[PDB]
Design an enzyme around this catalytic site. Structure first.
Site, PDB file in Angstrom:
ATOM      1  N   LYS B  86       0.807  -1.213   0.000  1.00 24.86           N
ATOM      2  CA  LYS B  86       0.000   0.000   0.000  1.00 24.86           C
ATOM      3  C   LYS B  86       0.846   1.271   0.000  1.00 24.86           C
ATOM      4  O   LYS B  86       0.419   2.306  -0.514  1.00 24.86           O
ATOM      5  CB  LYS B  86      -0.934   0.010   1.182  1.00 24.86           C
ATOM      6  CG  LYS B  86      -1.988  -1.105   1.124  1.00 24.86           C
ATOM      7  CD  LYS B  86      -2.909  -0.943   2.327  1.00 24.86           C
ATOM      8  CE  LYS B  86      -4.264  -1.642   2.200  1.00 24.86           C
ATOM      9  NZ  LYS B  86      -4.283  -3.126   2.423  1.00 24.86           N
ATOM     10  N   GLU B 108     -10.144   6.080   3.996  1.00 23.54           N
ATOM     11  CA  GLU B 108     -10.920   5.033   4.678  1.00 23.54           C
ATOM     12  C   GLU B 108      -9.988   3.880   5.010  1.00 23.54           C
ATOM     13  O   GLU B 108      -8.976   3.677   4.337  1.00 23.54           O
ATOM     14  CB  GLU B 108     -12.040   4.518   3.753  1.00 23.54           C
ATOM     15  CG  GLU B 108     -11.622   3.469   2.699  1.00 23.54           C
ATOM     16  CD  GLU B 108     -10.693   3.991   1.607  1.00 23.54           C
ATOM     17  OE1 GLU B 108     -10.639   5.209   1.358  1.00 23.54           O
ATOM     18  OE2 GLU B 108     -10.034   3.149   0.955  1.00 23.54           O
ATOM     19  N   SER B 376       2.073  -9.697  -0.870  1.00 22.44           N
ATOM     20  CA  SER B 376       1.654  -8.295  -0.685  1.00 22.44           C
ATOM     21  C   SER B 376       1.996  -7.701   0.645  1.00 22.44           C
ATOM     22  O   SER B 376       2.134  -6.485   0.754  1.00 22.44           O
ATOM     23  CB  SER B 376       0.165  -8.188  -1.006  1.00 22.44           C
ATOM     24  OG  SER B 376      -0.607  -9.092  -0.225  1.00 22.44           O
TER      25      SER B 376
HETATM   26  C1  LIG Z   1      -4.917  -4.249   2.142  1.00 23.26           C
HETATM   27  C2  LIG Z   1      -4.175  -5.442   1.711  1.00 23.26           C
HETATM   28  C3  LIG Z   1      -4.521  -6.319   0.602  1.00 23.26           C
HETATM   29  C4  LIG Z   1      -5.789  -6.169  -0.173  1.00 23.26           C
HETATM   30  O1  LIG Z   1      -5.923  -4.950  -0.848  1.00 23.26           O
HETATM   31  P1  LIG Z   1      -5.772  -4.897  -2.451  1.00 23.26           P
HETATM   32  O2  LIG Z   1      -6.157  -3.461  -2.789  1.00 23.26           O
HETATM   33  O3  LIG Z   1      -6.683  -5.924  -3.070  1.00 23.26           O
HETATM   34  O4  LIG Z   1      -4.345  -5.182  -2.767  1.00 23.26           O
HETATM   35  C5  LIG Z   1      -3.669  -7.346   0.284  1.00 23.26           C
HETATM   36  N1  LIG Z   1      -2.549  -7.593   0.972  1.00 23.26           N
HETATM   37  C6  LIG Z   1      -2.156  -6.858   1.992  1.00 23.26           C
HETATM   38  C7  LIG Z   1      -0.914  -7.198   2.741  1.00 23.26           C
HETATM   39  C8  LIG Z   1      -2.956  -5.748   2.422  1.00 23.26           C
HETATM   40  O5  LIG Z   1      -2.557  -4.973   3.442  1.00 23.26           O
HETATM   41  N1  LIG Z   2      -9.246  -2.960   4.522  1.00 23.14           N
HETATM   42  C1  LIG Z   2      -7.851  -2.793   4.001  1.00 23.14           C
HETATM   43  C2  LIG Z   2      -7.792  -2.550   2.477  1.00 23.14           C
HETATM   44  C3  LIG Z   2      -8.727  -1.498   1.947  1.00 23.14           C
HETATM   45  C4  LIG Z   2      -8.694  -0.141   2.182  1.00 23.14           C
HETATM   46  N2  LIG Z   2      -9.727   0.472   1.509  1.00 23.14           N
HETATM   47  C5  LIG Z   2     -10.434  -0.479   0.818  1.00 23.14           C
HETATM   48  C6  LIG Z   2     -11.571  -0.352   0.005  1.00 23.14           C
HETATM   49  C7  LIG Z   2     -12.064  -1.492  -0.565  1.00 23.14           C
HETATM   50  C8  LIG Z   2     -11.462  -2.746  -0.349  1.00 23.14           C
HETATM   51  C9  LIG Z   2     -10.353  -2.884   0.453  1.00 23.14           C
HETATM   52  C10 LIG Z   2      -9.827  -1.732   1.069  1.00 23.14           C
HETATM   53  C11 LIG Z   2      -7.170  -1.630   4.690  1.00 23.14           C
HETATM   54  O1  LIG Z   2      -7.799  -0.719   5.221  1.00 23.14           O
HETATM   55  O2  LIG Z   2      -5.937  -1.628   4.735  1.00 23.14           O
END
Ligand SMILES: *Cc1c(COP(=O)(O)O)cnc(C)c1O
Ligand SMILES: N[C@@H](Cc1c[nH]c2ccccc12)C(=O)O
Ligand SMILES: O=P(O)(O)OCCNS(=O)(=O)c1ccc(OC(F)(F)F)cc1
Ligand SMILES: O=P(O)(O)OCCNS(=O)(=O)c1ccc(OC(F)(F)F)cc1
Ligand SMILES: *Cc1c(COP(=O)(O)O)cnc(C)c1O
Ligand SMILES: N[C@@H](Cc1c[nH]c2ccccc12)C(=O)O
Ligand SMILES: [Cs+]
Ligand SMILES: [Cs+]
Ligand SMILES: [Cs+]
Ligand SMILES: [Cs+]
Ligand SMILES: [Cs+]
Ligand SMILES: [Cs+]
EC number: 4.2.1.20
Lengths: 268, 390, 390, 268
Positions: B86, B108, B376
């Site tokens: 991220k 968010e 990831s």
């Molecule tokens: C948030 C997260 C995901 C899922 O989010 P994507 O937008 O689908 O990549 C996957 N792996 C890790 C380690 C995360 O923190």
């Molecule tokens: N829940 C995860 C990834 C995430 C952030 N925003 C999202 C919107 C839609 C789907 C997943 C997410 C986080 O906050 O790190």
């Protein structure tokens, strides 16, 4: 049908503005919501704007978020909302009825079928809160095929291209936003920009109703004086419901007093 | 009117209230401008290298594949600053915010990783960050909430609706619809209204670009398949993007199967939901028969969302990418297997991708295949969850 | 008889029971052989690059130093696989074990980071790992104990003596004195009997070598000083080694001051202990008047040991390095400051080094100085400790 | 003094081996430890090996770790140990007394001063468990300056260079380790390698005492038969202390029985 057109013609003949309350269908339950709506009408509502409870109302502030929650606590579904709408129309043949929808409830199971149901129960307009003009084509086309007015929003900052589009695409009334942000009586908007109200008339737009943050009779009077055809109030109405949940008779009395005062302000 | 296509086939779009359209158009214009600006690109590259630690390693995992004809590499986004992929895109979005002259960030978060990533980028780059998080998630994610606060971010619990991720998404957009003149909305995945699916892909695409260069260096040829978990879609589209035009390279996205698809307790809308309009996009989602947005489920909070980004729905529709699911139990086994055989603790999100690669190998152990799993994130955060189960 | 000098001036040596001398001589011979073997070096380099993620970034920290004439870089060992510098040397020691033909690893741990590092290297490289940990530390370090077990290591609580790190050190040597024919003792710091202070320095010296190359690239000149915390001495000697012959470059080691030197609750033997013989070495230590080994204290478990490696005692004696102390409260402030101003969560160990650099800057804010702090680890592990205090 | 030399000459004249118990000074308290030691002597101990409690006894297994712990629970310090040693010597003028030390207690406050105190109280030898021959120079030199025998360890695997060094550097007796690892009755060692015992005699080493894991009379007899001058037993003795903590009179009776049996085995 021509319910908005007939309403605005009648009001124009009386030099009068429209007062249009918003409530959530089925808040706080189906039976009480029906009584609320009859009270709004008897107290002088010129038209109604009625919300179908949705899980994710992203244009609504906390007051209306909580109305949706109460309706869901009562088990209210869109099918029950359409049953309510048919009953309301059977009691009240001329009052324009507008729905406040979110896109998924319209698209879910077929856009055309949604507007067909609206026509069957006698709804006059649909405002899809999360469909901007840019995405509106299949919605507005289906609305018009089923004799439903698609309502579009004019932000206070609207540029000329947008005003032209809203004027061309909308029917029934033009929704004039008083401010940015989400619904709520806690946040008062501005007076209709005379430039906006005048451009809309220049472009032969449907008559403007100002909404967002309208909570007092003086704001109703002011909206009409600025050239709007009327004003919409939601959170202020829904707050009376919220305050009086435990006192259904008092709730109706306070709604009647409030609507009467708001409607009085719209008179010339 | 837009500069770029807001759709991927039928999916995507800009399903926001009219009041937010100028914010989206402004963001799209700033992005298009930034993408042509060598100074912006150099700034972004410098942060990625010297602050975040790119390029990340590509690790060959020989112990896991012993006795089979699978060769497995892991792209090590777990080694990025913050412990997940991220970080890449929050740095780029923070630079876009500054390009536009904005001083505040809204984000968010559900699992809390995006909230932490947003908070760290905002701390670094002088932005005032506020984070919406469903109250149920706040309760479950004390460590991340504390990290956000240590970094100076304001964490705002969201009590409306189901008090979880979709509800925090709604609240971020409510805020932005009144605050766009001064705040940028740092959306956390490759979903939401245009231009976010595009921006987030472009700010994650170094994952696949590096993977391509690294695998060519080590193996002299492209992978047979690249495999990534799919929550909202960012790490997977970041891995996939640079391979889309390499038609021989399989693209496999792994949705969470939860307790099993048949139970309905899953987060696999791409293969098991139906198209709807929500969160600014037309995309597959989990929804009730009459169109209310449903509750998703996964053991992994990062995958636990009832929709998915529109580019994945499009790549599936044309057959360019295949999507599968992996259950909680399969993810847990992959987590344990990587710890014990490679000494890497993977995020439970990433463990879904690894579990599918392990299945590819175990089901057909004499099939020649060169696989890359996008790892990831790291799984330090998951050790108690895994502990409490075993 | 040895191949290499076991002493640094008066400090160091091989103060083990006679039965362990052949094990130390065998290890020294294997190390000398490995250091001349390009295949060993290439294997080690490959693991460091492709598994651990080297080189680590060197990050300039502009927000912290704004309004002063200090330029501060952080060497990002926090980004190494495992989250601390310890990974470097465990990989090299695991390869030495294999070079000698040994199948088992013994390690001591207090904070648990070395136990985790040893367990991950053993998992990767096919070694059977057993870890001694004082029972009081086992109680305090559930997360690390669980990580070790997830990686397949056996964790053996030590209940003798004070049931903490020195007691685990003793028990590791007791075990090795009967098991050396099949087990290698993976000592966790640049201390203990020769050849460990030398081996651990050489397997950590890439920290300083990379720092030198990176600072020359960015600044065109060497640092005015490099600053590192000192628990047993490994990350600091790893940073210092390549600069020892660059006489202009200050070397500053930071011992834990605990509740304050005057309280006696600290872990600063180099400046506040006296020379003794323990753990196989002659070195400064905290000891009672009649020579029992004392209890040390720091908020940070990684610094909490009553002695220090002999090369640091030597570099201090000749004036080549200067040693200072930083209290718990000063370390906590540095931790909070880095989170909020740079979006990096530092280990509380490393926060001692950062706190001293911050003091160097704040005390003399118009002094021109180019500083590097070795950020030895990440501080995710410390967020509750910091939470519970604030 | 010549206490070991006189002892071994007397034993040789009787074709007899030495039996040498180990205990920790001040385990389980000073007064009881003094009674224990007098009991060992009265039961037939030829010499003593006495440990000074140390915080980190890295050549000792759990039995002796626990003896150190008990002594510390009683507040035993090295100064109190030296007071005990003076008293023991004043009661028993000819028995050789050896200390088992760890390096820090000898080095702490000056190596020379430590061996001077040993001479003052009448100790005969010091074995510093964590100082290998390679580090031994200042220890062995100070020992010899103060008429103390420095004891060195011969591992069962000792090569020729090591045997030569132990033979040259040591005095009093040569410690012949029965096995690798740490002290403990739970782990039995091997018979003295005849090669080791014979090389030591070839190099004119001090007479050998075998130690580690000696817990039965048959092992004593066997050590002597293999050419060692005697045997040391610690954990087996300390286990009797540990078992009988709550019964001090029974403790002395069991120590007496055990030592008598071990000493009987050393007779020709
Ligand atoms: C948030 C997260 C995901 C899922 O989010 P994507 O937008 O689908 O990549 C996957 N792996 C890790 C380690 C995360 O923190
Ligand atoms: N829940 C995860 C990834 C995430 C952030 N925003 C999202 C919107 C839609 C789907 C997943 C997410 C986080 O906050 O790190
Ligand atoms: O009085 P308030 O402040 O509660 O405002 C009530 C408005 N109720 S409504 O149905 O007209 C209405 C109209 C438009 C809305 O969103 C959109 F502009 F995005 F389309 C939301 C609600
Ligand atoms: O009977 P056990 O197995 O308890 O052995 C008792 C031995 N007691 S001792 O003082 O001779 C003794 C001798 C040497 C020791 O360590 C060293 F070899 F490293 F020097 C430790 C104790
Ligand atoms: C263990 C540890 C230290 C202290 O050990 P040294 O051998 O002195 O380097 C410092 N920092 C971190 C992050 C640690 O884990
Ligand atoms: N206690 C820390 C560092 C450490 C390991 N072994 C040591 C020996 C001496 C001093 C410190 C250490 C850890 O276990 O990770
Ligand atoms: Cs009026
Ligand atoms: Cs393989
Ligand atoms: Cs999902
Ligand atoms: Cs500066
Ligand atoms: Cs220390
Ligand atoms: Cs006999």
């Amino acid at each position: 049908m021509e319910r908005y057109e007939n309403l605005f013609a009648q009001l124009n003949d009386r030099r009068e503005g429209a007062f249009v309350p918003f409530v959530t269908l089925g808040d706080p339950g189906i039976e009480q919501s029906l009584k609320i709506i009859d009270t709004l009408i008897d107290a002088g509502a010129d038209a109604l704007e009625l919300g179908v409870p949705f899980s994710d109302p992203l244009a609504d502030g906390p007051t209306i978020q909580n109305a949706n929650l109460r309706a869901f606590a009562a088990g209210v579904t869109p099918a029950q909302c359409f049953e309510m709408l048919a009953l309301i129309r059977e009691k009240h043949p001329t009052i324009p009825i507008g729905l406040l929808m979110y896109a998924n409830l319209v698209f879910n199971n077929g856009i055309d079928a949604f507007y067909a149901r609206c026509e069957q129960v006698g709804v006059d307009s649909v405002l899809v809160a999360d469909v901007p003009v840019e995405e509106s084509a299949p919605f507005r086309q289906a609305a018009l095929r089923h004799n439903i007015a698609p309502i579009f929003i004019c932000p206070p900052n609207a540029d000329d291209d947008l005003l032209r589009q809203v004027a061309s695409y909308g029917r029934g009334y033009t929704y004039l936003l008083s401010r940015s942000g989400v619904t709520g009586a806690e946040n008062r908007g501005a007076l209709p920009l005379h430039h906006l109200i005048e451009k809309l008339k220049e472009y032969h737009a449907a008559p403007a109703l100002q909404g967002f943050g309208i909570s007092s009779p003086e704001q109703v009077s002011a909206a009409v004086r600025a050239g709007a055809a009327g004003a919409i109030s939601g959170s202020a109405i829904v707050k009376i419901i919220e305050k009086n949940l435990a006192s259904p008779k008092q709730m109706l009395a306070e709604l009647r007093s409030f609507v009467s005062a708001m409607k009085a302000a719209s008179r010339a | 009117t837009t500069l770029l296509n807001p759709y991927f086939g039928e999916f995507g779009g800009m399903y926001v209230p009219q009041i937010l359209m100028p914010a989206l158009n402004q963001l799209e214009e700033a992005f298009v401008s930034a993408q042509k600006d060598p100074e912006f690109q150099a700034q972004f590259a410098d942060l990625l290298k010297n602050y975040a630690g790119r390029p990340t390693a590509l690790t060959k995992c020989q112990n896991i594949t012993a006795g089979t004809r699978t060769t497995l590499y892991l792209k090590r986004e777990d080694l990025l600053h913050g412990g997940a992929h991220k970080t890449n895109q929050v740095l780029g979005q923070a630079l876009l915010a500054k390009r536009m002259g904005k001083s505040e960030i809204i984000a968010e978060t559900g699992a809390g990783q995006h909230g932490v990533a947003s908070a760290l980028a905002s701390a670094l780059l002088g932005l005032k960050c506020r984070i919406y998080m469903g109250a149920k998630d706040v309760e479950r994610q004390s460590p991340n909430v504390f990290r956000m606060r240590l970094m100076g971010a304001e964490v705002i619990p969201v009590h409306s609706g189901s008090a979880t991720l979709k509800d925090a998404c709604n609240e971020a957009l409510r805020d932005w619809s009144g605050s766009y003149e001064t705040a940028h909305y740092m959306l956390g995945t490759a979903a939401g209204p245009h231009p976010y699916p595009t921006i987030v892909r472009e700010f994650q695409r170094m994952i696949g670009e590096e993977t391509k260069a690294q695998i060519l260096d080590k193996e002299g040829r492209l992978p047979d398949a690249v495999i990534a978990c799919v929550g909202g879609g960012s790490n997977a589209i970041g891995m996939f993007a640079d391979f889309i035009n390499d038609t021989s390279v399989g693209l496999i996205g792994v949705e969470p199967g939860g307790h099993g698809i048949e139970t309905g307790e899953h987060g696999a809308p791409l293969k098991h939901g139906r198209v709807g309009i929500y969160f600014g996009m037309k995309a597959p989602m989990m929804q009730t028969a009459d169109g209310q947005i449903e509750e998703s489920y996964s053991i992994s909070a990062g995958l636990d969302f009832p929709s998915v980004g529109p580019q994945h729905a499009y790549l599936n529709s044309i057959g360019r990418a295949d999507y599968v699911s992996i259950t909680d139990d399969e993810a847990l086994e992959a987590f344990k297997t990587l710890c014990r055989h490679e000494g890497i603790i993977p995020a439970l999100e990433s463990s879904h991708a690894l579990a599918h690669a392990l299945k590819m190998m175990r089901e057909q152990p004499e099939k020649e295949q060169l696989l890359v799993v996008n790892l990831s994130g790291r799984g330090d955060k998951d050790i108690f969850t895994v502990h409490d189960i075993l």
